[PDB]
Amino acid sequence: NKVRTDKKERKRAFPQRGFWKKQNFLQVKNNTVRLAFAVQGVDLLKLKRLRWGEVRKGNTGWWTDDYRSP
Amino acid sequence: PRLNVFAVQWREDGQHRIRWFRAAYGLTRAMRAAENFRKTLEATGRVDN
Amino acid sequence: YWPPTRKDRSKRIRLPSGKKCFVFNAKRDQDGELEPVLCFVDSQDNLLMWFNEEELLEFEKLMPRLESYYELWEEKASRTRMKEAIVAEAES
Amino acid sequence: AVPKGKRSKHKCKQRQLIYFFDQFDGVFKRRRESFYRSFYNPPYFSKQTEQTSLPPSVLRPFRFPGFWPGRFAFKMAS
């Protein structure tokens, strides 16, 4: 509970090895959001990955700089 | 469904008797074994009529 | 295995572009089974793709249609050069 | 079973050193030697951390400039 009123803190006391990861569902959700922005034509992943002070117009990256020697 | 096995019902000397047939080895194999057992019963003449 | 010896391929057919092609038995991607295959290679002898009898027969049917496109698109291509040059040679 | 009495300070003290030696001879000493070997090789660079991490490097710095002969810096060009 958000209010923190139930007995949900009992189990947490004991140590655990690991927990589930809903990757399958999360991936789908992310994909749907990505699609919803792509139909408009804006890259979200690109902006979520670019270096702080980095400028990359369009579909460009490290690879772009290879052939662009001059 | 729960036992996951075939059964054969036949009457002998006015008494009901059922035999087990595990289908773990194969569905078709168990089905054919049960059918052959019933046919053997009828051929040897151990079913009331 | 890849390199076909003299006794495992037919005569190579050279193209104007330098691309070569031959007929040999190739392991299909399905299961790796040998079947009659039409292998295509570039100038540097690199595998690009392959077909089979079915594919080739299918493609032969479609070839006529594709030819019209070559003539059609050419016009466009030509006209784009005129559109670029008319302004390149009049306002440079 | 259950303890019959309380452990003295002395015992604990002894145990402390015992444990420290035990650990040192088997964990720490091995780790130190493993760490020190990597120096010869270039540092490790992670692809994941590229967003914030500094560019790759090979050359190692010198912590003791007092015993560092030879040139330290190059004169500026005209």
Partner: protein, 197 residues
């Protein structure tokens, strides 16, 4: 493009269930793969393989080329520079417009392309190549038919049959159900009861 930029309505106009779910995700990555000026794709029956004719961008002469760079060498394109900042400042266009400026390429190289089910480039063919390939078609059918005869069956089946005929084949038990207080005897018998008149 496989998608309409800035489409009308408040919802997608295409299915988003089944295989289409995957296809949308696959195609969203590449919003510009299919040239605006391209012939319709023509897939083949057996294996997903499409054909289409398009126009490619020009390139700089190899003479003027620096050299291969990076793990994927590629020749540079032939394009003019964008307007400079000094001219863009005086231009009446907005900042948004000015920032969004790009180069200008020349599309005058007509070529035929073959892709997979996924519209993945595989090979490129020109007019001369296509014309040359047509003259060798009859010579290739005979070679294919001749080579078809060299294939032989798989000896796997025969070896397995001989193996099973002249070898042992142990079989283990399955479904060893336990029992409670009362044990089993292979067969069971029912009960008999009388009616109450």
């Amino acid at each position: 493009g496989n998608f309409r930029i800035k489409p009308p309505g408040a919802r997608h106009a295409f299915p988003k269930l089944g295989t289409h779910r995957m296809v949308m995700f696959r195609r969203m990555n590449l919003l510009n793969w299919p040239p605006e000026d391209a012939s319709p794709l023509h897939p083949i029956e057996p294996w997903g393989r499409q054909f289409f004719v398009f126009n490619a961008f020009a390139t700089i002469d190899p003479a003027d080329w620096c050299g291969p760079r990076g793990p994927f060498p590629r020749l540079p394109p032939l394009a003019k520079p964008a307007p400079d900042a000094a001219t863009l400042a005086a231009s009446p266009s907005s900042l948004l417009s000015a920032l969004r400026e790009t180069e200008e390429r020349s599309a005058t190289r007509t070529v035929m392309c073959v892709t997979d089910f996924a519209q993945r480039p595989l090979m490129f063919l020109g007019k001369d190549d296509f014309r040359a390939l047509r003259e060798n078609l009859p010579r290739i059918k005979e070679e294919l038919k001749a080579f078809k005869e060299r294939i032989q069956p798989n000896p796997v089946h025969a070896q397995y049959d001989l193996r099973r005929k002249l070898l042992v084949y142990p079989r283990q038990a399955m479904q060893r159900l336990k029992t409670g207080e009362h044990g089993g005897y292979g067969t069971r018998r029912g009960t008999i009861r009388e009616r109450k008149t």
